[PDB]
Design a protein around this ligand. Structure first.
Ligand code: MG
Ligand code: ZN
Ligand code: ZN
Lengths: 1205, 81
DNA sequence: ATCATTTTACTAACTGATAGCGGAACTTTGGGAGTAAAAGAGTCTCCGCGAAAATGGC
DNA sequence: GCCATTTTCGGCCTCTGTGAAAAACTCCCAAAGTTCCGCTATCAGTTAGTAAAATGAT
């Protein structure tokens, strides 16, 4: 229907064209008949009838008279919904300035007229004059005159000049302006200007003037003469129960405006004294400003609630505004909500749904099937049968929901795994039954949690739920690629208990034919689950090439391990099950099953694992008791020793040998050491036991303590919590953060006293409050990331670019932090991976690096590779499939139309709640910094080189001595400037001292061409440079935090990308959160979307102008094809908020935040919204250009071009 | 009945294109009079279309081909009138 | 295949009622003008927020 | 180039009416509103009558 949204200024003729009449009276409804009043805010002659196909008279009261205007009233006989579309207008007695174009900084009227806002307000506030036509007088246009001065020059010259007050003066000045003449004069002045501030001022004014000329808008339209009036049904006055009426504040504001306008007209009819007329005009201006934007001009007008009235700007803007409350998010039909329970019998794609709840949700389908089979003749009969709840209705409901997917969603939806598709199963109850394995996906526990359900209606939606959103497809985490359906708690505990080993168990040493005989022995009470036996295992390996090799051999194992192998699918080794299975082992089993067998086998294996774990956790009988918490006997001795030497050092303090701070420090140190010793003793006492073996001797066995088993299996608990239960609680902090000297020397088994409990509450309250605030911080950060990256969609397959980023193992000392395999998993090779010291192409170009090639690289021992990245992509809009790589949630190359930006933003923002020189290897030494490289050719040590035992290339043996998170991520993504940034070498040359100017110092640098560049530096700076040294570009002069803008300007795109990725990943890896770097590079690419033009060239770009990089790239390509001088640009780094607000589309910018500024800029410029992103299509209700809509949108674009031909 | 839409995405390659093709086939079988090429086995049109795609009987090529065929046949029939 | 009769299709008339429209008169409501000692500067309370960025002023 | 005052932002679900004060009569006139009566259009109910078609008997 429509392809673009055009915004701009509204002319009075256009406003009259919109309006269906003029509102002349502030009347709303009669107080007796409750009927609209003529020429009022609710007039039926202007806005439409209040009853369908009726008139206020009642003479025309049926449909035969449609479109006929009653002669007695004037009300057109039509539908009432026209009252939601029909507009009105008010003919204002005097012009009023638009508040948005006057007080939204920068003031557009002041910018256009080159006058300060204060002077314009003084003219508007009726204080001092302004000259409109100077005439044949020394007076100049736009200069300000006091009343006394006005009288003097009026007695002097008389009618030769015209000087006015108010918005009439501003409109008579704006209309007298010649935009082309001003543009030419300011172009000439900018050509012969030198000052930078003046350059900025007139370049802004020139941009505004050229925008006005290009858009076709007139400046005088910024002063309102005709005021449009909203449809009554959008500002309704409707009766409540009990005779009360509910009204909108817009009615009060409109009534005020109409009353003041009518009073002004009456005063002008009476030939009023001037002062009263000026007061009335001020009141009219104030009323119009309050109606448009209340509180911006001055004191906000309040009603009878002592609370400010809500205006149109408040109605369209804010968190509670239309954009965020009704356009980007809506309340929907065919939805429900219920508490969630656990269904251990369900399959991974099944969810338990109440029968009544499904009956209410699927009611139209039940009607359709009740008529199709002839059980109900008409829809009323079907409704009656559904209401009476007959058995055939239940059968119809069962047939309806058979293969109909349903959507389950839990708030908050941090990532896309928070909404999934399941097959409903009717259950007797009122609570939704949920599969346990999806709980980690939902972050849901059964302590009162509620989940919402949605019913996809169309066939397309059902197939989308079945194919994309089904739980069986979403078993890999899109943030990392690791499995997300890993077992936890009871399943892990059962698999751990069954796979444990016991010494001298019943049935030890027996020989079993296989898992079936092991199960038979277990059920017959012949052998225990933990008896060491020898089992004949038939084991099949599916190799990388697809070879299926079956080997039958006898393996030493336990009965439980074979019984668990009974459910392991074919194609996996027995070594995965021939061990005690914690959370890590089961996760590895599931990952191997996915990587070697597929998805269906993985789903069945996960279901069987959950069933077996639940069953054998039930059969285990694991229980927590007061005897399971064994406090070590060494704890009391250690406490006594610590207290004694505390007494000794207190005596030392009374002697003056040490200060109070040293005493505090060593008391804290000893208390930490004693806590560590007590924890070690308790862990040793809890982890082991002595048993009698077959020979009769005493053997060492791992303990079967319930708490120890819970902690070791990884189901629930850790070493720290066991330490608090059976050891020491440790030192705690004061509310400010300082650590109390005396720690809690008691655990929870013995019990704390009053003081220790109070100290514990000190930190518990801090933790709870920190969680509460960090949740909101993470939500805001995620929203900003989504709004900055929502436009990134995979649009092509290959962009044909040779650029890429270099990838090496991440080294932070003598050990590797992350391997090259982890970073290269799923990336496309940019240049061929040659074998070290050889010219053989091991891995060719444009090949995805999967597990096989990762193993190949690890075996070959390749150190540095180059891969394609989203930041270096050449795609005009979005990115291409190859530059992105494997999609972590699916395992293959990313498909066309994937909204990778939203996935990246969600992946980064979801863990926000969790967020708060001696050589050690044998090899050679290489200098660039200090690097130690092994004999295989891998760099295994990286260390800094402050300004040595071995020289470059000298072999070094082992042991030789050569000699806070979430705010950090927020500032990193916002490109925040550090308070004390590091001074960086702007240009390459030799350093030279200069005049030590008072206040702060100056320095100079001599380039290769002899040009001297001056640098301004503060006094308090520990300089690293020395005179006579040629410092390279990007060398550090003053140490400190590095500004990302400086890194981008002086090092390049790759350097800033690496810096941001490394810092964000350091913050995340400190907490143990695994997030792929392509997400952070999809955010960094969005940051680097603007360029400032340095060389204008012949393209339509001005120097000092910030424009989009893609447009400049296309313009440069066109100019090169035309053989004309191309443009030169300097890429700019913007934060996520500024990049979000600097988008080409104004709908998305207005929907994000600061609607007033965005709308004002779009209106003055006359911007056009092409609806190319997700948010615009969501707001206008069209298909998003991502996924299943992608092809659709593509088709339209083709037709566009084909028609434009 | 069917679960785990793997074979279909292997035959098609792209999940979204598969969704669109299956939606077209299901609309043909439900709104139109077209019959299934596989035993129904008490399955909804979406499941039948997915099974047909898995068996290789239905692709985008086939659908567009037979749609153009129906337009040609209808044009010839209207000429015959 | 043909005749005679009942039912069908079509006019007229009377009964009785009911709703709608128009005119006369009365009560109810609604808008407007007037009030002559003199009276001749407002509120109106609050203000328990912090951090970062974008505009004037020098 | 640097203060100094504005400007705008601050997670997702579910229930969940509010506010409450505050100061005129008096007279005159025209228009809307209520009620009543008369005229007229329209219809449901019933009967009678006449001419013709359907139909059964022979
Ligand atoms: Mg909970
Ligand atoms: Zn009317
Ligand atoms: Zn690319």
């Amino acid at each position: 229907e429509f392809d673009a949204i055009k915004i701009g200024l509204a002319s009075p003729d256009m406003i009259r064209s919109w309006s269906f009449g003029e509102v002349k009276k502030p009347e709303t409804i009669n107080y007796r008949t409750f009927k609209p009043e003529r020429d009022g805010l609710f007039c039926a002659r202007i806005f439409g009838p209040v009853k369908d196909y009726e008139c206020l008279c009642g003479k025309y009261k049926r449909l035969k008279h449609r479109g006929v205007i009653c002669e007695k009233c004037g009300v057109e006989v039509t539908q009432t919904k026209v009252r939601r579309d029909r507009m009105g207008h008010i003919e204002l007695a005097s012009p009023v300035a638009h508040i948005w174009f006057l007080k939204s900084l920068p003031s557009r009227i002041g910018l256009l007229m080159d006058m300060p806002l204060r002077d314009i307000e003084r003219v508007l506030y009726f204080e001092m004059y302004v000259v409109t036509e100077p005439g044949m007088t020394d007076l100049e246009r736009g200069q300000m005159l006091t009343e006394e001065e006005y009288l003097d020059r009026l007695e002097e010259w008389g009618d030769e000049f015209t000087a006015k007050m108010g918005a009439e003066a501003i409109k008579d000045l704006l209309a007298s302006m010649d935009l082309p003449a001003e543009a030419e004069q300011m172009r000439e002045e900018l050509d012969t200007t030198n000052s930078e501030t003046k350059r900025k001022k007139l370049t802004k004014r020139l941009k505004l003037v050229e925008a006005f000329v290009a858009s076709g808008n007139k400046p005088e339209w910024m002063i309102l003469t005709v005021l449009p009036v909203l449809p009554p049904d959008l500002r309704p006055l409707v009766p409540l129960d009990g005779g009360r009426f509910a009204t909108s504040d817009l009615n009060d504001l409109y009534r005020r405006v109409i009353n003041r306008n009518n009073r002004l007209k009456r005063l002008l009819e009476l030939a009023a004294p001037d002062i009263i007329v000026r007061n009335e005009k001020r009141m009219l201006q104030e009323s119009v400003d309050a109606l448009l934007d209340n509180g911006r001009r001055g004191r906000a007008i309040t009603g009878s609630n002592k609370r400010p009235l809500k205006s149109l700007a408040d109605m369209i803007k804010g968190k509670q505004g239309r954009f965020r409350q009704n356009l980007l998010g809506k309340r929907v039909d065919y939805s429900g909500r219920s508490v969630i329970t656990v269904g251990p019998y369900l399959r991974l794609h099944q969810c338990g749904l109440p029968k009544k709840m499904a009956l209410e949700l699927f009611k139209p389908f039940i009607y359709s099937k009740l008529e199709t089979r002839g059980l109900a003749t008409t829809i009323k009969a079907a409704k009656k049968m559904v209401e009476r709840e007959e058995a055939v209705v239940w059968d119809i409901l069962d047939e309806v929901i058979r293969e109909h997917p349903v959507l389950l969603n839990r708030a908050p939806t941090l990532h896309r795994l928070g909404i999934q598709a399941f097959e409903p199963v009717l259950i007797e109850g009122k609570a939704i039954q949920l599969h346990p394995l999806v709980c980690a996906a939902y972050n849901a526990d059964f302590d009162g949690d509620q989940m919402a359900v949605h019913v996809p209606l169309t066939l397309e939606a059902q197939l989308e739920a079945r194919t994309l959103m089904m739980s069986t497809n979403n078993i890999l985490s899109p943030a990392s690629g690791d499995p997300i359906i890993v077992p936890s708690q009871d399943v892990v505990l059962g698999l751990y208990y069954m796979t444990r080993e016991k010494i001298n168990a019943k049935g030890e040493g027996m020989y079993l034919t296989g898992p079936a005989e092991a199960e038979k022995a277990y059920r017959t009470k012949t052998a225990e689950l933990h008896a060491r036996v020898k089992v004949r295992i038939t084991e099949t390996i599916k190799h990388e090439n697809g070879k299926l090799t079956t080997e039958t051999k006898m393996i030493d194992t336990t009965v439980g391990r074979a019984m668990l192998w009974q459910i392991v699918p074919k194609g996996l080794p027995y070594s995965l099950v021939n061990q005690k299975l914690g959370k890590k082992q089961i996760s590895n089993l599931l990952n191997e099953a996915y990587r070697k067998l597929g998805l269906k086998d993985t789903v069945i294996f996960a279901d069987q694992i959950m069933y077996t774990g639940f069953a054998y956790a039930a059969l285990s009988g694991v229980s927590v008791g007061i005897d399971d918490m064994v406090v070590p006997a060494a704890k009391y001795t250690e406490i006594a020793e610590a207290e004694e030497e505390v007494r000794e050092i207190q005596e030392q303090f009374q002697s003056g040998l040490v200060t109070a701070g040293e005493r505090y420090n060593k008391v804290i140190d000893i208390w930490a050491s004693t806590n560590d010793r007590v924890a070690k003793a308790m862990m040793e006492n809890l982890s082991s036991e002595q048993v009698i073996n077959r020979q009769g001797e005493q053997e060492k066995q791992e303990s079967f303590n319930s708490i120890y088993m819970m902690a070791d299996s990884g189901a629930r608990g850790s070493a720290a919590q066991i330490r608090q239960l059976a050891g020491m609680r440790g030192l705690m902090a004061r509310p400010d953060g300082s650590i109390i000297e005396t720690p809690i020397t008691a655990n929870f088994k013995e019990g704390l006293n009053v003081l220790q409990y109070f100290i514990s509450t000190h930190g518990a309250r801090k933790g709870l409050a920190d969680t509460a605030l960090k949740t909101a911080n993470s939500g805001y950060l995620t929203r900003r990331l989504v709004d900055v990256a929502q436009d990134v969609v995979v649009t092509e397959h290959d962009c044909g670019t040779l650029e890429g980023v270099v990838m090496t193992p991440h080294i932070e000392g003598g050990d590797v932090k992350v391997a090259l395999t982890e970073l290269a998993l799923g990336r496309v090779v940019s240049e061929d991976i040659l074998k070290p010291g050889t010219d053989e192409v091991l891995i060719p170009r444009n090949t995805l690096l999967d597990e096989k090639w990762c193993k190949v690289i690890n075996d070959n021992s390749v150190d540095q590779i180059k891969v394609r990245s989203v930041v270096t992509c050449d795609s005009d809009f979005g990115c291409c499939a190859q530059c992105y790589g494997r999609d972590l949630a699916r395992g293959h190359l990313v498909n066309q139309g994937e909204a990778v930006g939203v996935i990246a933003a969600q992946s980064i923002g979801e863990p926000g709640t969790q967020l708060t020189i001696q050589a050690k290897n044998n090899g050679s030494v290489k200098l660039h910094e200090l690097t130690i490289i092994d004999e295989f050719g891998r760099t295994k040590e990286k260390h800094k080189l402050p300004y040595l035992s071995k020289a470059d290339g000298d072999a070094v043996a082992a042991g030789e001595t050569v000699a806070g998170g979430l705010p950090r991520v927020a500032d990193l993504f916002e490109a925040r400037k550090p308070k004390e940034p590091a001074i960086l070498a702007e240009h390459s040359g030799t350093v030279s001292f200069g005049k030590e100017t008072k206040g702060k110092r100056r320095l100079i640098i001599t380039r290769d061409s002899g040009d001297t560049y001056e640098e301004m530096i503060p006094k308090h700076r520990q300089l690293n440079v020395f005179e006579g040294e040629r410092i390279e570009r990007g060398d550090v002069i003053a140490d400190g935090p590095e500004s990302p803008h400086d890194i981008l300007r002086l090092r390049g795109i790759h350097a800033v990308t690496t810096y941001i990725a490394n810092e964000v990943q350091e913050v995340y890896r400190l907490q143990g959160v695994k997030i792929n770097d392509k997400h952070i590079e999809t955010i960094v690419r969005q940051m680097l979307r603007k360029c400032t033009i340095t060389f204008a060239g012949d393209s339509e770009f001005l120097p000092g102008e910030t424009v989009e990089y893609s447009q400049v790239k296309i313009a440069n390509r066109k100019l090169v094809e035309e053989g004309k001088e191309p443009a030169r640009f300097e890429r700019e780094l913007l934060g996520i908020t500024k990049a979000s607000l600097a988008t080409e589309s104004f709908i998305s910018a207005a929907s994000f935040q600061e609607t007033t500024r965005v709308l004002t800029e779009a209106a003055v410029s006359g911007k056009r919204d092409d609806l190319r992103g997700l948010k615009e299509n969501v707001i206008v209700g069209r298909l998003i250009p991502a996924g299943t809509g992608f092809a659709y949108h593509q088709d339209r674009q083709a037709k566009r071009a084909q028609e434009q031909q | 009945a069917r679960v785990t839409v793997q074979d279909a995405v292997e035959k098609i390659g792209n999940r979204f294109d598969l969704v669109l093709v299956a939606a077209r086939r299901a609309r043909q079988m439900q709104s139109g009079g077209k019959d299934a090429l596989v035993p129904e086995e008490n399955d909804k049109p979406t499941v039948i279309a997915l099974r047909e795609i898995e068996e290789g009987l239905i692709t985008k090529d086939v659908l567009d081909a037979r749609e153009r065929q129906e337009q040609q046949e209808q044009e010839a029939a209207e000429l015959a009138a």
